[PDB]
């Protein structure tokens, strides 16, 4: 399981207990878990349980959630993207 | 992600931001990401961020997307397949 | 498959023949199979056939199942969690 600052969950549209994919840019590991809410403003990204074998403190990761929808809705769908730098400082654009 | 020539996306019915599976024929690695549009006619297949750990320039890959539908429709369903050889030259069927 | 004491299936809301994810805390391995019922009160967790390559007797694992539902319901959804220690002794919450 992966505990994530509620502000980050809000920005990416990710729900507590939602399935998430974690793609580790640092070590190339790819795994699927679920999202846990961490305190708003904590800027926490905590990899808990078995997932601690796949990521370490300091690793750069992508955290993605996927939803299903009919083809017509899919063709105009805009994903909710949050970009990070420095001390898990969030921005709207790259 | 994986950035793909929009002509290739059009032929295979794969959408921007759609979940895709990448099966690497060269090194046997198998991973899941999402599709990005590359410039029409560029013949680009670009493995971006964490996915760069799973494929190298020159690797031969199969890129697949999956949809759900009721059993009754699934029995007659027809996938959208594009065939390639050489430098991402799409064979006459489109 | 994975054979699981029916008491444990009952507590976690996991069904016979349901897709499950197994996350191995001991060795870090992550795999997907389906659940089988073991005898009620047996406290059995049995990894059967190909899955025997991914877990050994004594390994600590987390077994999860996932469901889909519309966003409106997902916002208030409450997972069924059973906690264990020692020899598969379920902690008082059931």
């Amino acid at each position: 399981s992966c505990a994530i600052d509620q502000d980050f969950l809000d920005a990416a549209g990710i729900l507590e207990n939602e399935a998430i994919d974690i793609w580790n840019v640092t070590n190339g590991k790819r795994f699927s878990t679920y999202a846990i809410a961490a305190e708003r403003g904590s800027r926490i990204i905590s990899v808990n349980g078995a997932a601690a074998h796949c990521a370490s403190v300091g690793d750069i990761v992508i955290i993605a959630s996927f939803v299903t929808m009919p083809d017509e809705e899919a063709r105009t769908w805009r994903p909710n993207v949050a970009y990070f730098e420095g001390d898990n400082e969030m921005k709207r654009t790259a | 992600s994986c950035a793909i020539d929009q002509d290739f996306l059009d032929a295979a019915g794969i959408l921007e931001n759609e979940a895709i599976d990448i099966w690497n024929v060269t090194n046997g690695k198998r991973f899941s990401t999402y599709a990005i549009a590359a410039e029409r006619g560029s013949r680009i297949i670009s493995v971006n961020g964490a996915a760069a750990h799973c494929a190298s320039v020159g690797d031969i890959v199969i890129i697949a997307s999956f949809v759900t539908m009721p059993d009754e429709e699934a029995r007659t369903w027809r996938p959208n397949v594009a065939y390639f050889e050489g430098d991402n030259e799409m064979k006459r069927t489109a | 498959s994975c054979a699981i004491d029916q008491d444990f299936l009952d507590a976690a809301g996991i069904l016979e023949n349901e897709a499950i994810d197994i996350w191995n805390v001991t060795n870090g391995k992550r795999f997907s199979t389906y659940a089988i019922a073991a005898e009620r009160g047996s406290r059995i967790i049995s990894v059967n056939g190909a899955a025997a390559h991914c877990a050994s007797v004594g390994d600590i694992v987390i077994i999860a199942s996932f469901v889909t539902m519309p966003d409106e319901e997902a916002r208030t959804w409450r997972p069924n969690v059973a906690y264990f220690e020692g020899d598969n002794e379920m902690k008082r919450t059931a």
Binding site: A3, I4, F8, A11, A12, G13, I14, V25, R43, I44, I45, S46, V47, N48, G49, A52, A55, S56, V57, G58, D59, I60, V61, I62, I63, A64, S65, F66, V67, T68, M69, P70, D71, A74, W77, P79, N80, V81, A82, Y83, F84, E85, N88, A94 | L15, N17, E18, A19, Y34, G49, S65, F66, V67, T68, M69, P70, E72, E73 | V25, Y83
Partner: peptide, 26 residues
């Protein structure tokens, strides 16, 4: 009725840094 259903990226946290790892989380 019998609509073909796509799996789409809902959202992502791009290049966030892991702050904590807890093997023994309960």
């Amino acid at each position: 009725a019998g609509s073909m259903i796509r799996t789409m990226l809902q959202g992502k946290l791009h290049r966030v840094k892991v702050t904590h790892a807890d093997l023994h989380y309960e």
